[PDB]
Write a protein that binds this ligand. Structure first.
Ligand SMILES: *[C@@H]1O[C@H](CO)[C@@H](O[C@@H]2O[C@H](CO)[C@@H](O[C@@H]3O[C@H](CO)[C@@H](O)[C@H](O)[C@@H]3O)[C@H](O)[C@H]2NC(C)=O)[C@H](O[C@@H]2O[C@@H](C)[C@@H](O)[C@@H](O)[C@@H]2O)[C@H]1NC(C)=O
Ligand SMILES: *[C@@H]1O[C@H](CO)[C@@H](O[C@@H]2O[C@H](CO)[C@@H](O[C@@H]3O[C@H](CO)[C@@H](O)[C@H](O)[C@@H]3O)[C@H](O)[C@H]2NC(C)=O)[C@H](O[C@@H]2O[C@@H](C)[C@@H](O)[C@@H](O)[C@@H]2O)[C@H]1NC(C)=O
Ligand SMILES: *[C@@H]1O[C@H](CO)[C@@H](O[C@@H]2O[C@H](CO)[C@@H](O[C@@H]3O[C@H](CO)[C@@H](O)[C@H](O)[C@@H]3O)[C@H](O)[C@H]2NC(C)=O)[C@H](O[C@@H]2O[C@@H](C)[C@@H](O)[C@@H](O)[C@@H]2O)[C@H]1NC(C)=O
Ligand SMILES: *[C@@H]1O[C@H](CO)[C@@H](O[C@@H]2O[C@H](CO)[C@@H](O[C@@H]3O[C@H](CO)[C@@H](O)[C@H](O)[C@@H]3O)[C@H](O)[C@H]2NC(C)=O)[C@H](O[C@@H]2O[C@@H](C)[C@@H](O)[C@@H](O)[C@@H]2O)[C@H]1NC(C)=O
Ligand SMILES: *[C@@H]1O[C@H](CO)[C@@H](O[C@@H]2O[C@H](CO)[C@@H](O[C@@H]3O[C@H](CO)[C@@H](O)[C@H](O)[C@@H]3O)[C@H](O)[C@H]2NC(C)=O)[C@H](O)[C@H]1NC(C)=O
Ligand SMILES: *[C@@H]1O[C@H](CO)[C@@H](O[C@@H]2O[C@H](CO)[C@@H](O[C@@H]3O[C@H](CO)[C@@H](O)[C@H](O)[C@@H]3O)[C@H](O)[C@H]2NC(C)=O)[C@H](O)[C@H]1NC(C)=O
Ligand SMILES: *[C@@H]1O[C@H](CO)[C@@H](O[C@@H]2O[C@H](CO)[C@@H](O[C@@H]3O[C@H](CO)[C@@H](O)[C@H](O)[C@@H]3O)[C@H](O)[C@H]2NC(C)=O)[C@H](O)[C@H]1NC(C)=O
Ligand SMILES: *[C@@H]1O[C@H](CO)[C@@H](O[C@@H]2O[C@H](CO)[C@@H](O[C@@H]3O[C@H](CO)[C@@H](O)[C@H](O)[C@@H]3O)[C@H](O)[C@H]2NC(C)=O)[C@H](O)[C@H]1NC(C)=O
Ligand SMILES: *[C@@H]1O[C@H](CO)[C@@H](O[C@@H]2O[C@H](CO)[C@@H](O)[C@H](O)[C@H]2NC(C)=O)[C@H](O)[C@H]1NC(C)=O
Ligand SMILES: *[C@@H]1O[C@H](CO)[C@@H](O[C@@H]2O[C@H](CO)[C@@H](O)[C@H](O)[C@H]2NC(C)=O)[C@H](O)[C@H]1NC(C)=O
Ligand SMILES: *[C@@H]1O[C@H](CO)[C@@H](O[C@@H]2O[C@H](CO)[C@@H](O)[C@H](O)[C@H]2NC(C)=O)[C@H](O)[C@H]1NC(C)=O
Ligand SMILES: *[C@@H]1O[C@H](CO)[C@@H](O[C@@H]2O[C@H](CO)[C@@H](O)[C@H](O)[C@H]2NC(C)=O)[C@H](O)[C@H]1NC(C)=O
Lengths: 163, 160, 163, 160, 163, 163
């Protein structure tokens, strides 16, 4: 549901004094190859929340080249015993790929909160419809790592309940 | 640019005799937890094209639960010396994450085909705007693996 | 974010054996004036949930002419002491109009769940961004009534927390 | 058909010197609870046009918090004998709810202007597809009041 | 505002008994090159309305390959003294190109119907925003021909006034 | 896929120092009738590329009134023996109308590049789905002229192969 792009690219000007839907852009003539790579995932999680989750975000706020292009990827690492609590992504679907460890991944539908839940091991994909309450719990040994691909440059994230 | 969903989910009925924009759906009341997991990536590449590329596709055609939900992920594995050739994804952006090996990833803009190209190592991301000509070359020692996340259930792919 | 209409109207065929995004339609040549009125709100709430809320829904599931046209209105009645609990509308904004009694209406943003809350009396409007956790509490005398206008034929509704 | 929002909210800066599709926004960090309520409907109609209609508008121009969020509600009050004349909402559907009095509400399709018209009494809803010519006539004894919910922050209005 | 296509093409099955938003499609495997050409404009206008206008329509109803692809072209020919009356295209912009003769082309805005009117000679373009009341009158000698490009497979057309 | 317009019109301010998705706009109160006509097609092609193609562009970059309104028209003239090479329009469908001369027009699908090719004479239409590789070659005598209608204010254009 992100607005369609009206040109090739439009790098977010993160220090603009203006506020618009999304971000104003830098001069596209000034873009270089370096603007289209993002290397943030090379930094390991620097900490975890009280529930054992670290999220490393890659939205247009972190990766200016994502502006207008409709995509986000977030890396989630769960300590042993860690969980996400109940969360939503208000403005995007989330396609989860497990890459390390083992997790319980589930979402609740809008039909009396019917729960669709599966155990994921590395390689597994799990799709979360937009805005629906979901969770991840680490059920394996060591850390669990998964990547969420979302169809918005800024899906948003909200903690909705605790466990 | 995928049409927005008008309900929670709508699993593609791949055996329907009808043809519509996207796919007709199975009865949502019959959907189970098993319908929202996809395990295709656990199968290693079974072969490679003449250029050393294997693509393992996860569109709504392979993962029915993606129907109406606007996302695709593809796994690409390149043998040493492998290349993707020049390709487009006509109907989606592509966000590439390198996970193994090292690649050259680039795309051409519509302004005299200016080339934006970078070396990617595991962890790096590279964004290809929708429809733009792009390529990947394996410049590392072993196999290169990267995943393309696309904002369509069926972005399409074309060698140009 | 509802798909745009590709013709004047497309009345939901609610007894179709097919399932598609949205609803298949009846033959538009068979539509009559009666198909574009909906009188469900003339029935008073027939009951309330354990927390004192009655919702009378008008989505495309109840009002076939809404199919493809991107709108829903729901009537909410709260008994004295009643509340909605914490809820989301996953796929639409919600514009609330209070018409009877007095309510506390609020939503939480995705920025550390900052709460935006106001007391509403009849005539007041309050806008809930899409997918964001929100609530209504009856703080007046007697029943509270408000109408939610949503920009989807089927916004969805999910109870996300209790109070 | 309103562009999707790219953040939680984006209050219209109505005093901006810039002009863009929609409105530039105020700093979201400065938004308060007061920004998400609108109390304009507490003012009764201050006057009526020659045809006995008063419209009290709530678009993003009046209610800045509606900016990017895709909704509008307008209150229409018709004096006895009043009428709206033939009008369109070019960029949105209109879902009409009658709340006081009795009205004739109708719209014309694009198929030889077939007329779909119904009598509405309080509680009734009537849906007008986007852009289609429509009208309301007061057929009751007192004032008629109805609210139009539209799926745009700025649907537009035109007498045709 | 047409829904985005979810595949390469989707030729309208005009003989389907089903009704959905837009059209159900033929088997894309059966599509041939001939399905993507439309030659209706080789037919001259066969008649004119009360007022001297002939419209030759190319929507998805006439050109099945337009289904899901978001475009329509209409050819309009005006006899001497002919006019369109006041009309709207409810669901699309219209980009008019004059190719023969001379016309007065105008639309009214929603701001108290301010009139934007220009007269066009062959080669000229004039843009009509979506849904806005507009008209064209033949002000030259002989026939006037112009083509309307619209960003919908089925923009719709309505006479709204009589001029 | 162009973002929907949020007002009647929004003429591109091409002299703005700002960069956003699309274009910032001039004050709509200053717009006049002349802002909605574009006469660029009155200029004949001033030159041709290596290969005998001239494109006269009418995007929002040339015709500011197209901004937010979702349409573009391009005129293409091919010298004898001329061709476009393999090209894409990344962000729009293209509806081609041949008006002078004779052309071979084709596009390749994403299904192993199956070729859909037709030859066109004046009046014929041919639809190119968005982003798909396509070409036109002049196969008649003299100049060939066709107009491309695209459902974007800035579809973009890319040479993808050399034929
Ligand atoms: C789960 O994931 C966390 C975060 O990635 C791991 O903790 C991190 O481990 C890094 C490497 O093991 C630590 O960096 C090292 O720091 C030392 C001294 O400062 C350096 O000499 C060394 O070269 C590295 O740079 C990093 O400090 C640490 N980060 C955090 C936030 O804790 C964690 O690893 C496990 O826990 C830590 C506390 C150590 O005991 C590790 O040995 C141990 O593996 C991951 N857990 C598992 C089971 O893999
Ligand atoms: C690059 O990636 C490809 C595909 O993932 C690797 O080839 C695959 O290697 C597997 C071994 O890890 C092969 O499985 C074996 O198959 C034989 C034949 O029946 C079995 O008897 C045996 O028990 C294993 O199951 C798999 O068949 C093979 N697939 C293909 C399509 O070739 C490749 O590995 C390298 O090449 C193969 C041919 C072997 O020589 C591997 O030992 C070798 O590492 C990957 N290349 C690199 C450099 O990592
Ligand atoms: C809050 O809203 C509820 C639902 O609208 C009100 O309860 C409803 O009141 C109706 C009319 O007062 C009841 O219908 C009547 O039934 C009787 C006997 O069956 C008939 O003789 C009569 O003609 C009406 O048809 C309806 O039964 C009732 N519905 C429910 C679900 O309770 C409620 O009204 C208040 O509570 C009820 C229990 C009565 O005591 C009412 O007198 C009282 O006003 C509304 N509350 C307020 C404060 O307005
Ligand atoms: C139809 O709706 C209109 C607008 O809401 C009603 O007119 C309004 O009636 C108010 C009374 O309820 C007027 O307020 C009074 O104004 C005077 C003048 O200064 C004050 O001194 C006095 O204290 C009140 O505040 C209000 O001015 C008036 N507005 C307009 C634009 O006319 C209308 O009511 C009917 O007409 C008016 C003129 C009075 O005669 C009312 O008593 C009468 O009911 C509504 N019509 C009906 C049939 O309900
Ligand atoms: C989870 O782990 C990630 C990765 O280690 C942490 O992300 C890092 O968080 C810090 C502090 O929030 C960020 O620092 C910020 O950097 C920007 C760079 O311009 C600067 O402007 C800010 O003022 C601030 O210094 C850092 O960028 C960020 N790194 C990445 C790759 O995202 C995250 O904090 C961890 N979460 C928790 C809860 O511990
Ligand atoms: C690259 O590697 C992937 C992963 O091994 C290969 O994908 C696999 O391809 C086979 C054959 O195309 C698929 O089997 C087919 O399934 C369909 C539908 O069930 C059926 O009609 C066929 O008869 C056949 O059984 C298999 O599902 C697929 N697996 C996954 C996970 O996608 C791919 O073939 C390799 N590409 C090349 C060029 O070697
Ligand atoms: C809140 O009050 C409303 C209005 O009184 C109640 O709505 C009504 O609910 C009943 C039972 O769910 C509906 O009955 C159904 O009618 C359809 C009509 O075709 C039928 O197919 C079903 O099998 C069933 O009989 C009724 O339609 C509905 N009325 C309206 C106007 O929506 C609602 O149940 C109350 N909620 C609670 C929690 O009490
Ligand atoms: C129908 O009744 C409504 C409700 O009384 C009238 O709306 C009110 O109209 C006045 C004058 O147009 C608005 O005041 C103006 O506000 C702007 C912006 O602050 C300012 O620039 C002007 O100088 C003037 O003060 C007032 O805000 C507005 N109230 C509401 C709630 O919308 C409307 O005028 C009546 N229509 C007719 C035809 O009588
Ligand atoms: C305007 O002229 C066109 C072109 O001849 C007419 O279009 C044909 O109309 C008949 C009758 O409905 C159809 O069966 C044909 O398929 C149409 N052909 C094409 C190419 O569109 C049209 O009828 C004329 N309109 C009026 C009002 O006279
Ligand atoms: C305007 O166009 C009409 C329709 O094409 C012309 O009438 C046709 O003229 C041709 C001669 O070239 C006849 O073969 C057709 O039978 C006529 N058809 C109809 C429906 O009249 C008309 O001559 C044109 N007038 C001018 C002044 O250009
Ligand atoms: C194709 O012909 C057109 C029409 O003359 C040329 O368009 C002009 O190009 C100049 C130089 O960039 C611009 O300053 C003008 O504003 C253009 N006018 C119009 C109406 O577009 C175009 O340059 C030619 N292209 C080639 C490759 O020769
Ligand atoms: C094809 O088109 C070109 C461009 O319009 C023609 O060349 C022009 O011819 C006119 C004469 O009518 C001259 O006034 C221009 O100066 C020429 N311009 C250029 C750039 O050459 C050409 O003659 C046409 N050829 C055919 C066979 O139709």
């Amino acid at each position: 549901a992100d607005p369609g792009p009206l040109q090739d690219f439009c790098l977010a000007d993160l220090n603009s004094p203006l506020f618009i839907n999304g971000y104003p852009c830098r001069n596209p003539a000034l873009a270089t190859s370096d603007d289209f790579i993002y290397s943030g995932f090379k930094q390991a999680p620097s900490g975890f929340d009280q529930w054992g989750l670290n999220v490393t975000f890659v939205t247009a706020g972190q990766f200016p080249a994502l502006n207008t292009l409709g995509l986000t990827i977030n890396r989630c690492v769960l300590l042993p015993g860690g969980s996400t609590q109940f969360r939503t992504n208000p403005r995007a679907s989330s396609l989860v790929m497990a890459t390390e460890g083992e997790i319980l991944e589930g979402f609740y539908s809008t039909n009396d909160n019917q729960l669709y839940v599966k155990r994921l091991t590395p390689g597994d994909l799990f799709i979360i419809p937009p805005g629906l309450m979901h969770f991840t719990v680490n059920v394996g040994t060591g850390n669990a790592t998964f990547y969420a691909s979302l169809n918005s440059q800024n899906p948003g994230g909200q903690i909705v309940g605790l466990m």
